[PDB]
Protein backbone atom coordinates (compact mmCIF):
# COMPACT_ATOMS: atom_id res chain seq x y z
CA UNK A 1 0.00 0.00 0.00
CA UNK A 2 1.21 3.48 -0.91
CA UNK A 3 0.82 5.41 2.35
CA UNK A 4 1.68 8.70 0.67
CA UNK A 5 -1.19 8.06 -1.72
CA UNK A 6 -3.45 7.40 1.26
CA UNK A 7 -2.34 10.70 2.77
CA UNK A 8 -3.20 12.41 -0.51
CA UNK A 9 -6.66 10.87 -0.57
CA UNK A 10 -7.25 11.87 3.06
CA UNK A 11 -6.23 15.46 2.34
CA UNK A 12 -8.45 15.49 -0.74
CA UNK A 13 -11.51 14.53 1.28
CA UNK A 14 -10.71 16.96 4.07
CA UNK A 15 -10.38 19.73 1.49
CA UNK A 16 -13.64 18.72 -0.18
CA UNK A 17 -15.46 18.71 3.17
CA UNK A 18 -13.66 21.69 4.72
CA UNK A 19 -16.86 23.75 4.95
CA UNK A 20 -19.08 20.80 5.90
CA UNK A 21 -17.08 18.81 8.45
CA UNK A 22 -14.73 19.88 11.21
CA UNK A 23 -12.83 16.62 10.88
CA UNK A 24 -12.61 13.66 8.55
CA UNK A 25 -12.42 10.06 9.69
CA UNK A 26 -10.54 7.12 8.28
CA UNK A 27 -11.41 3.51 9.07
CA UNK A 28 -8.63 0.97 8.61
CA UNK A 29 -9.55 -2.68 9.14
CA UNK A 30 -7.31 -5.72 9.01
CA UNK A 31 -6.99 -9.07 10.75
CA UNK A 32 -4.19 -9.78 13.26
CA UNK A 33 -0.76 -9.16 11.76
CA UNK A 34 -2.16 -7.35 8.72
CA UNK A 35 -0.08 -4.28 9.51
CA UNK A 36 -3.02 -2.00 10.27
CA UNK A 37 -1.26 -0.57 13.33
CA UNK A 38 1.87 0.42 11.40
CA UNK A 39 -0.02 1.68 8.36
CA UNK A 40 -2.14 3.91 10.59
CA UNK A 41 0.95 5.26 12.35
CA UNK A 42 2.78 6.03 9.09
CA UNK A 43 -0.28 7.65 7.53
CA UNK A 44 -0.63 9.85 10.59
CA UNK A 45 3.06 10.78 10.70
CA UNK A 46 3.14 11.64 6.98
CA UNK A 47 0.18 14.00 7.32
CA UNK A 48 1.52 15.77 10.39
CA UNK A 49 4.94 16.15 8.78
CA UNK A 50 3.42 17.77 5.70
CA UNK A 51 1.54 20.16 7.96
CA UNK A 52 4.66 21.04 9.95
CA UNK A 53 6.53 21.74 6.72
CA UNK A 54 3.64 23.98 5.68
CA UNK A 55 3.83 25.94 8.95
CA UNK A 56 7.55 26.51 8.40
CA UNK A 57 6.80 29.06 5.67
CA UNK A 58 3.34 30.09 6.89
CA UNK A 59 4.48 30.81 10.54
CA UNK A 60 1.45 32.66 11.90
CA UNK A 61 -1.35 31.23 9.79
CA UNK A 62 -3.09 29.42 12.65
CA UNK A 63 -6.27 30.99 13.99
CA UNK A 64 -8.76 29.62 16.50
CA UNK A 65 -12.32 30.83 15.88
CA UNK A 66 -15.65 30.69 17.72
CA UNK A 67 -14.07 32.43 20.69
CA UNK A 68 -17.49 33.70 21.84
CA UNK A 69 -19.36 30.43 21.39
CA UNK A 70 -20.14 27.80 24.03
CA UNK A 71 -18.32 24.46 24.11
CA UNK A 72 -19.91 21.68 22.07
CA UNK A 73 -21.79 19.45 24.52
CA UNK A 74 -20.72 15.93 23.62
CA UNK A 75 -22.45 13.81 26.25
CA UNK A 76 -25.66 15.68 27.05
CA UNK A 77 -27.60 12.75 25.55
CA UNK A 78 -26.11 10.41 28.16
CA UNK A 79 -27.59 9.84 31.60
CA UNK A 80 -25.49 10.91 34.56
CA UNK A 81 -24.09 8.17 36.77
CA UNK A 82 -25.34 9.56 40.09
CA UNK A 83 -22.68 10.13 42.80
CA UNK A 84 -23.86 7.10 44.77
CA UNK A 85 -23.56 4.78 41.77
CA UNK A 86 -20.16 6.25 40.88
CA UNK A 87 -18.82 5.33 44.32
CA UNK A 88 -20.25 1.81 44.00
CA UNK A 89 -18.53 1.27 40.64
CA UNK A 90 -15.21 2.53 42.00
CA UNK A 91 -15.66 0.32 45.05
CA UNK A 92 -16.21 -2.60 42.65
CA UNK A 93 -12.82 -1.97 41.00
CA UNK A 94 -14.35 0.31 38.36
CA UNK A 95 -16.71 -2.32 36.97
CA UNK A 96 -20.43 -2.94 36.45
CA UNK A 97 -20.68 -6.59 37.54
CA UNK A 98 -24.16 -7.17 36.10
CA UNK A 99 -23.50 -5.66 32.66
CA UNK A 100 -20.07 -6.84 31.50
CA UNK A 101 -21.61 -8.84 28.63
CA UNK A 102 -24.56 -6.53 27.93
CA UNK A 103 -24.03 -4.97 24.50
CA UNK A 104 -27.14 -2.85 25.09
CA UNK A 105 -25.87 -1.22 28.29
CA UNK A 106 -25.89 2.49 27.49
CA UNK A 107 -22.81 4.60 28.28
CA UNK A 108 -23.10 6.89 31.30
CA UNK A 109 -21.22 10.04 32.32
CA UNK A 110 -19.89 11.60 35.52
CA UNK A 111 -17.48 14.26 36.77
CA UNK A 112 -14.05 12.72 37.38
CA UNK A 113 -10.19 21.41 36.09
CA UNK A 114 -13.44 19.56 35.34
CA UNK A 115 -13.12 16.25 33.50
CA UNK A 116 -16.11 14.26 32.25
CA UNK A 117 -15.72 10.49 32.15
CA UNK A 118 -17.86 8.35 29.84
CA UNK A 119 -18.04 4.63 30.65
CA UNK A 120 -19.93 1.64 29.31
CA UNK A 121 -19.94 -2.09 30.08
CA UNK A 122 -16.16 -2.21 30.40
CA UNK A 123 -16.12 0.25 33.28
CA UNK A 124 -13.42 2.81 34.00
CA UNK A 125 -10.73 0.79 32.21
CA UNK A 126 -12.20 1.77 28.83
CA UNK A 127 -13.38 5.22 29.87
CA UNK A 128 -13.38 8.12 27.41
CA UNK A 129 -12.51 11.44 29.06
CA UNK A 130 -13.61 14.89 27.94
CA UNK A 131 -12.03 18.08 29.29
CA UNK A 132 -12.81 21.77 28.75
CA UNK A 133 6.17 20.81 15.25
CA UNK A 134 3.94 20.89 18.32
CA UNK A 135 0.63 21.16 16.45
CA UNK A 136 -0.59 17.90 14.94
CA UNK A 137 -3.69 17.67 12.79
CA UNK A 138 -3.87 13.88 12.58
CA UNK A 139 -4.31 11.39 15.42
CA UNK A 140 -4.87 7.64 15.56
CA UNK A 141 -7.51 5.80 17.56
CA UNK A 142 -6.53 2.16 18.07
CA UNK A 143 -9.43 -0.14 18.96
CA UNK A 144 -7.06 -1.91 21.39
CA UNK A 145 -7.74 0.52 24.22
CA UNK A 146 -11.31 -0.72 24.31
CA UNK A 147 -10.32 -4.29 25.05
CA UNK A 148 -12.18 -5.38 28.18
CA UNK A 149 -9.89 -5.65 31.20
CA UNK A 150 -8.76 -9.04 32.43
CA UNK A 151 -10.70 -8.52 35.67
CA UNK A 152 -13.73 -7.65 33.55
CA UNK A 153 -13.38 -10.92 31.65
CA UNK A 154 -13.34 -12.73 35.01
CA UNK A 155 -16.95 -11.64 35.45
CA UNK A 156 -18.15 -13.29 32.24
CA UNK A 157 -20.79 -15.96 32.82
CA UNK A 158 -18.06 -18.28 31.55
CA UNK A 159 -14.66 -16.90 32.74
CA UNK A 160 -12.80 -19.88 31.25
CA UNK A 161 -13.75 -18.63 27.79
CA UNK A 162 -13.41 -14.90 27.07
CA UNK A 163 -9.77 -15.14 28.21
CA UNK A 164 -9.22 -18.16 25.98
CA UNK A 165 -10.90 -16.21 23.19
CA UNK A 166 -9.67 -12.77 24.21
CA UNK A 167 -9.63 -10.74 21.02
CA UNK A 168 -13.06 -11.83 19.81
CA UNK A 169 -15.66 -9.12 19.09
CA UNK A 170 -17.30 -9.87 22.44
CA UNK A 171 -14.14 -9.11 24.44
CA UNK A 172 -14.14 -5.36 23.66
CA UNK A 173 -16.34 -2.63 25.12
CA UNK A 174 -18.14 -2.14 21.79
CA UNK A 175 -20.68 0.03 23.63
CA UNK A 176 -18.13 2.69 24.52
CA UNK A 177 -16.28 2.47 21.21
CA UNK A 178 -19.55 3.19 19.44
CA UNK A 179 -20.00 6.07 21.89
CA UNK A 180 -16.60 7.45 20.89
CA UNK A 181 -17.77 7.29 17.28
CA UNK A 182 -20.95 9.22 18.13
CA UNK A 183 -18.83 11.84 19.90
CA UNK A 184 -16.52 12.08 16.90
CA UNK A 185 -19.44 12.38 14.49
CA UNK A 186 -20.90 15.16 16.63
CA UNK A 187 -17.62 17.08 16.60
CA UNK A 188 -17.42 16.56 12.84
CA UNK A 189 -20.93 17.81 12.13
CA UNK A 190 -20.40 21.01 14.10
CA UNK A 191 -20.91 24.38 12.42
CA UNK A 192 -17.63 25.03 10.58
CA UNK A 193 -9.67 32.89 -1.37
CA UNK A 194 -7.27 29.92 -1.41
CA UNK A 195 -6.96 26.32 -2.60
CA UNK A 196 -4.42 25.15 -0.03
CA UNK A 197 -5.97 22.54 2.27
CA UNK A 198 -3.52 23.45 5.03
CA UNK A 199 -4.33 27.16 4.70
CA UNK A 200 -8.05 26.43 4.98
CA UNK A 201 -7.73 24.14 7.99
CA UNK A 202 -5.34 26.54 9.74
CA UNK A 203 -7.92 29.33 9.64
CA UNK A 204 -10.82 27.17 10.84
CA UNK A 205 -9.80 25.59 14.15
CA UNK A 206 -12.55 26.05 16.74
CA UNK A 207 -12.32 26.95 20.43
CA UNK A 208 -15.60 25.06 20.96
CA UNK A 209 -14.01 21.62 20.52
CA UNK A 210 -12.83 20.06 23.81
CA UNK A 211 -9.94 17.65 24.30
CA UNK A 212 -11.07 14.03 24.08
CA UNK A 213 -8.89 11.41 25.77
CA UNK A 214 -9.14 7.80 24.67
CA UNK A 215 -7.71 4.68 26.34
CA UNK A 216 -4.76 2.74 24.99
CA UNK A 217 -3.57 -0.81 25.54
CA UNK A 218 -0.53 -1.56 27.68
CA UNK A 219 1.02 -4.71 26.19
CA UNK A 220 3.08 -5.11 29.37
CA UNK A 221 0.22 -5.00 31.87
CA UNK A 222 -2.01 -6.90 29.44
CA UNK A 223 -4.75 -4.32 30.02
CA UNK A 224 -6.18 -1.01 28.78
CA UNK A 225 -4.68 2.20 30.18
CA UNK A 226 -6.21 5.73 30.43
CA UNK A 227 -5.77 8.77 28.19
CA UNK A 228 -3.16 7.37 25.79
CA UNK A 229 -4.48 9.32 22.82
CA UNK A 230 -5.74 12.88 22.84
CA UNK A 231 -8.04 14.18 20.13
CA UNK A 232 -8.06 17.98 20.44
CA UNK A 233 -9.47 20.96 18.57
CA UNK A 234 -6.36 20.68 16.38
CA UNK A 235 -7.15 17.12 15.32
CA UNK A 236 -8.85 17.43 11.93
CA UNK A 237 -8.14 13.87 10.79
CA UNK A 238 -8.88 10.84 12.96
CA UNK A 239 -7.52 7.49 11.84
CA UNK A 240 -9.34 4.61 13.52
CA UNK A 241 -7.76 1.18 13.10
CA UNK A 242 -9.03 -2.13 14.41
CA UNK A 243 -10.32 -5.63 13.84
CA UNK A 244 -14.04 -4.97 14.02
CA UNK A 245 -14.73 -1.51 12.63
CA UNK A 246 -16.58 -3.11 9.70
CA UNK A 247 -18.06 -6.09 11.58
CA UNK A 248 -21.78 -6.72 10.89
CA UNK A 249 -22.83 -7.59 14.44
CA UNK A 250 -24.16 -5.78 17.51
CA UNK A 251 -22.60 -2.37 18.22
CA UNK A 252 -19.84 -2.84 15.64
CA UNK A 253 -22.34 -2.73 12.80
CA UNK A 254 -23.37 0.75 13.90
CA UNK A 255 -19.80 2.08 13.57
CA UNK A 256 -19.70 2.49 9.79
CA UNK A 257 -23.05 4.25 9.59
CA UNK A 258 -22.24 6.48 12.56
CA UNK A 259 -19.03 7.67 10.88
CA UNK A 260 -20.24 7.34 7.28
CA UNK A 261 -23.22 9.58 8.00
CA UNK A 262 -20.85 12.50 8.63
CA UNK A 263 -20.18 12.54 4.90
CA UNK A 264 -16.47 12.65 5.69
CA UNK A 265 -15.26 9.05 5.89
CA UNK A 266 -12.64 7.03 4.00
CA UNK A 267 -12.71 3.26 4.51
CA UNK A 268 -9.84 0.82 3.93
CA UNK A 269 -9.73 -2.92 4.45
CA UNK A 270 -6.44 -4.80 4.22
CA UNK A 271 -6.36 -7.99 2.15
CA UNK A 272 -3.58 -10.14 3.59
CA UNK A 273 -0.91 -12.37 2.11
CA UNK A 274 -1.88 -15.55 3.95
CA UNK A 275 1.57 -17.15 4.24
CA UNK A 276 3.41 -14.00 5.33
CA UNK A 277 0.70 -13.12 7.81
CA UNK A 278 0.54 -16.67 9.15
CA UNK A 279 4.28 -16.52 9.82
CA UNK A 280 4.03 -13.06 11.34
CA UNK A 281 1.30 -14.07 13.80
CA UNK A 282 2.93 -17.41 14.57
CA UNK A 283 6.09 -15.51 15.50
CA UNK A 284 4.16 -13.13 17.76
CA UNK A 285 2.68 -16.06 19.64
CA UNK A 286 6.12 -17.63 20.00
CA UNK A 287 7.74 -14.39 21.18
CA UNK A 288 4.84 -13.88 23.58
CA UNK A 289 5.17 -17.38 24.99
CA UNK A 290 1.70 -18.50 23.88
CA UNK A 291 3.29 -21.42 22.01
CA UNK A 292 6.56 -23.35 22.33
CA UNK A 293 7.36 -23.57 18.59
CA UNK A 294 6.57 -21.69 15.40
CA UNK A 295 4.69 -24.77 14.11
CA UNK A 296 2.32 -24.59 17.07
CA UNK A 297 1.85 -20.91 16.28
CA UNK A 298 1.03 -21.60 12.63
CA UNK A 299 -1.46 -24.26 13.74
CA UNK A 300 -3.25 -21.83 16.06
CA UNK A 301 -3.41 -19.33 13.20
CA UNK A 302 -4.91 -21.85 10.79
CA UNK A 303 -7.52 -23.17 13.23
CA UNK A 304 -8.59 -19.86 14.80
CA UNK A 305 -10.78 -17.78 12.49
CA UNK A 306 -10.28 -14.75 14.75
CA UNK A 307 -6.59 -14.93 13.85
CA UNK A 308 -6.61 -15.88 10.16
CA UNK A 309 -9.18 -13.22 9.31
CA UNK A 310 -11.96 -15.55 8.16
CA UNK A 311 -14.38 -14.22 10.77
CA UNK A 312 -13.75 -10.60 9.78
CA UNK A 313 -14.27 -11.42 6.09
CA UNK A 314 -17.41 -13.47 6.69
CA UNK A 315 -18.85 -10.59 8.70
CA UNK A 316 -17.68 -7.67 6.55
CA UNK A 317 -20.56 -5.19 6.25
CA UNK A 318 -22.04 -4.96 2.76
CA UNK A 319 -21.30 -1.39 1.66
CA UNK A 320 -19.97 0.07 -1.60
CA UNK A 321 -17.23 2.34 -0.23
CA UNK A 322 -14.77 -0.17 1.26
CA UNK A 323 -11.43 0.26 -0.51
CA UNK A 324 -9.48 -3.01 -0.32
CA UNK A 325 -5.73 -2.54 -0.05
CA UNK A 326 -2.73 -4.87 0.03
CA UNK A 327 0.19 -4.77 2.44
CA UNK A 328 2.56 -7.31 0.92
CA UNK A 329 6.26 -7.50 1.80
HG1 LIG B 1 -4.61 -11.42 18.10
HG1 LIG C 1 -16.16 -8.43 31.04
HG1 LIG D 1 -21.67 19.56 16.32
HG1 LIG E 1 -4.29 16.76 24.97
Amino acid sequence: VDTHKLADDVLQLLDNRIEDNYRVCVILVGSPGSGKSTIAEELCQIINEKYHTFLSEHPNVIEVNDRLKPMVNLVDSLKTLQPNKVAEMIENQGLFKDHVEDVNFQPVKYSAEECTAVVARGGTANAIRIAADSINIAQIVPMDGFHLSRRCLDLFKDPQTAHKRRGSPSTFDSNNFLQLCKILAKTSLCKVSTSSVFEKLSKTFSQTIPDIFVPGFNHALKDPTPDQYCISKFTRIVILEGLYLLYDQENWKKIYKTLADTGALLVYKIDIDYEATEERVAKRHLQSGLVTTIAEGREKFRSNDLLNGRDIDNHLIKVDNIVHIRNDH
Side-chain angles (χ1 to χ4, degrees), residues 1-190 192-329:
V1 62
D2 189 308
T3 63
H4 281 77
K5 176 53 179 298
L6 288 184
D8 290 333
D9 294 323
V10 172
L11 295 181
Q12 179 167 61
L13 182 53
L14 178 58
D15 187 69
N16 270 158
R17 306 292 298 182
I18 200 66
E19 290 174 56
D20 301 301
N21 297 90
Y22 189 72
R23 39 177 58 139
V24 299
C25 292
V26 178
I27 281 175
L28 176 58
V29 166
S31 52
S34 60
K36 58 182 176 294
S37 175
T38 64
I39 291 169
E41 304 177 318
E42 300 178 65
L43 174 57
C44 186
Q45 298 279 55
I46 289 173
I47 294 171
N48 289 323
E49 280 173 43
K50 287 172 171 294
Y51 188 59
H52 295 156
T53 298
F54 169 77
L55 295 177
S56 164
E57 309 191 336
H58 303 77
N60 304 297
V61 67
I62 296 177
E63 296 187 55
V64 181
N65 313 291
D66 303 315
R67 292 167 292 179
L68 301 182
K69 295 187 173 186
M71 300 299 287
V72 176
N73 195 311
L74 302 175
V75 295
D76 54 61
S77 303
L78 297 185
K79 98 176 184 62
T80 301
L81 186 59
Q82 296 303 308
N84 58 298
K85 292 293 177 294
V86 175
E88 183 182 304
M89 165 188 78
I90 298 298
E91 182 175 301
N92 296 314
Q93 314 311 119
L95 291 172
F96 294 116
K97 187 178 186 303
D98 304 315
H99 297 288
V100 297
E101 302 181 72
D102 182 5
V103 301
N104 269 191
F105 178 71
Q106 291 302 297
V108 296
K109 64 184 178 187
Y110 67 88
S111 304
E113 214 295 299
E114 65 177 303
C115 179
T116 300
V118 175
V119 294
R121 77 182 216 262
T124 61
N126 306 123
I128 293 165
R129 293 189 173 65
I130 309 173
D133 306 304
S134 176
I135 298 299
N136 296 310
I137 56 170
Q139 179 57 289
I140 55 175
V141 171
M143 197 181 90
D144 300 282
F146 287 83
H147 202 73
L148 293 173
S149 68
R150 294 178 304 122
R151 178 173 289 81
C152 193
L153 298 180
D154 295 316
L155 299 174
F156 265 48
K157 186 60 184 178
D158 187 58
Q160 53 179 298
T161 302
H163 291 75
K164 180 280 183 63
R165 188 177 172 181
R166 207 187 182 193
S168 70
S170 65
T171 59
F172 287 88
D173 189 341
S174 62
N175 310 33
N176 224 208
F177 190 83
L178 174 58
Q179 193 55 42
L180 172 61
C181 293
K182 294 188 174 183
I183 288 175
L184 292 177
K186 185 165 185 174
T187 56
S188 176
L189 294 169
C190 86
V192 179
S193 58
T194 183
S195 60
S196 169
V197 65
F198 294 145
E199 181 81 53
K200 299 176 187 176
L201 73 80
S202 294
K203 299 297 187 186
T204 54
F205 287 118
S206 177
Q207 191 60 49
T208 66
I209 302 294
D211 286 346
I212 300 169
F213 294 93
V214 304
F217 195 79
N218 188 299
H219 299 290
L221 300 181
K222 308 296 178 58
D223 273 316
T225 180
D227 322 316
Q228 293 294 150
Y229 307 95
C230 174
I231 297 171
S232 73
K233 61 174 64 63
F234 296 111
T235 311
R236 306 296 283 283
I237 293 167
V238 179
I239 300 160
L240 302 95
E241 57 98 347
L243 300 163
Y244 310 122
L245 308 183
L246 293 172
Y247 202 76
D248 67 17
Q249 298 298 307
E250 47 134 315
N251 295 144
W252 305 110
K253 183 175 181 176
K254 305 174 187 177
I255 291 175
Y256 172 75
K257 181 173 176 57
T258 295
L259 298 182
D261 283 351
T262 61
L265 173 72
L266 278 181
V267 183
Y268 299 104
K269 196 282 180 179
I270 303 173
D271 280 1
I272 68 173
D273 172 307
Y274 198 84
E275 275 291 359
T277 303
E278 180 187 71
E279 180 190 65
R280 186 171 295 86
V281 174
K283 288 187 176 180
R284 291 184 181 177
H285 284 57
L286 180 60
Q287 300 174 305
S288 302
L290 286 56
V291 294
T292 70
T293 68
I294 190 73
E296 286 164 20
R298 294 176 182 288
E299 171 60 63
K300 178 177 178 179
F301 181 82
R302 300 191 304 261
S303 64
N304 194 329
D305 294 340
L306 293 173
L307 291 178
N308 57 44
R310 284 190 179 187
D311 192 60
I312 286 167
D313 291 337
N314 295 335
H315 289 278
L316 192 65
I317 56 174
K318 301 289 189 181
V319 301
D320 54 296
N321 289 173
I322 302 176
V323 179
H324 286 70
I325 58 175
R326 301 289 304 187
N327 183 46
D328 304 308
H329 302 295

